[PDB]
Structure formats: C-alpha cells, structure tokens
Write a sequence for this structure.
C-alpha cells in the first residue's frame, strides 16, 4: 500500500548489479495476475503463497521474466514454472521451480541468483529497499522502494516504504544487497510487511533448494 514515505525509483538497467534476479511474474488464469519474485537458484525463484495460488493448481500458468524492463521487453525472455512448494509455516512464502527455456537455458543461469542474508545483523530502523514490479506503474517496469524496517518479530517484518499491487513477492534487500525478506503486501495507512527470513525459514529454504546461497 501507499504510505507517507513513498520513495520509489525506476530501475532501467535491470541486468546491472543486484537487480538482475528481481523478476516480473504473470499468472494466466479469468484474467492475468501480476506479481514479482526473486531468483535464488539455478532453477528456483521465491514469491508469495497467494501469487502461487493464482495458478489454481496449474504451475504452467505461471511465467517469470527476470530483469524485465517494460512491457514486452524481457532481456532474458520468460520461464514457465513446473513445480511449486509452499512454505509450511504461516509466512506467505512459496518456492517455484522452473523448467529451462526454448534455448535450453535455466532461469538461474541467465541471471545470477540473489545472495540470501543470514540476517544476523538485521535490526529495526535499518535502511532497506523493496524492489519489484508495482502495478500502479507502467506494465512490467521495475521500481526500487526505499524505507526503514519498523518491526521485527519471528518470521515477520514490517517497514515504512510504499508498494502497490504487483509488488507481491518482491525481494527485500539490506544495504549489502542481500535478500533479508520477501514482501507480501500491507495494511492501508499502517504498514507494509514481508516474510522475514529467520532461522526457521532459512532451514526450510535450504532443505528445498540445494544450491541456494546464504552469505
Ligand atoms: Zn529516493
């Protein structure tokens, strides 16, 4: 949701630096559901349970476009999901595995997977960014939203930065450009939040993704 702190910048050079694995998602149902996500392995991407539920039991309905720049401008093309594993906890988190594309390339090869933080030093009041694809902006455009962490408890985190429908599943980056959480949404006039990747979540990811990298 939009908050008093609405500080967002468009990322045009999407394949530069830590932005490459930030991904645009389209789920074809009924209508087209839009969301975001982040590549964290050779064939794996993280997003929310609710974006994955938009496929209504059909993984093939989910397409990921890493580093998408704008409508029909996908520098790495797209990838179709083949298998989905939802987080067993309360956290709105899901793991999506993709099959290679027509050129036999893997989603985690055309782009360098993001580095996951161990979150040892993460704390309230730290400056972070949530980068993904807001639906109030031009189609398939990547935007970085700036703010501070305002709440940390268990596997949940909240922050004061703005997001909009479409940002579902956007990675939360700390200053070191490591993924510390996965954005799920927010509450009007209150806050936006994400699944905080603590020890429990980390162990879950490690058990389901053999090549995920934690700093
Ligand atoms: Zn700014």
């Amino acid at each position: 949701v939009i908050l008093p702190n609405n500080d967002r910048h468009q990322i045009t050079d999407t394949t530069n630096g830590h932005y490459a694995p930030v991904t645009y998602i389209q789920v074809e149902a009924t209508g087209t559901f839009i969301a975001s996500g982040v590549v964290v392995g050779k064939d794996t991407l993280l997003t929310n349970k609710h974006v994955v539920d938009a496929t209504h039991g059909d993984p093939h309905a989910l397409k990921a476009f890493p580093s998408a720049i704008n409508q029909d401008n996908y520098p790495n093309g797209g990838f179709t999901a083949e298998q989905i594993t939802k987080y067993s906890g309360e956290g709105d988190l899901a793991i999506v595995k993709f099959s290679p594309n027509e050129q036999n390339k893997h989603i985690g090869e055309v782009v360098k997977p993001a580095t996951m933080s161990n979150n040892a030093e993460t704390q309230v009041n730290q400056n972070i960014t949530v980068t993904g694809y807001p639906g109030d902006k031009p189609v398939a455009t990547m935007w970085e939203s700036k703010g501070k962490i305002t709440y940390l408890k268990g596997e949940a985190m909240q922050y004061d930065l703005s997001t909009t429908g479409g940002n579902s599943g956007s990675p939360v980056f700390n200053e070191k450009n490591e993924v510390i959480g996965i954005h799920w949404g927010g509450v009007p006039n209150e806050f936006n939040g994400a699944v905080f990747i603590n020890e429990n979540v980390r162990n879950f990811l490690k058990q389901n993704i053999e090549d995920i990298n934690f700093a």
Summary: The radius of gyration is 15 Å. The chain has two domains: 1-14+115-215, 15-114. The longest strand covers residues 142-153. The chain has three helices and 13 strands.
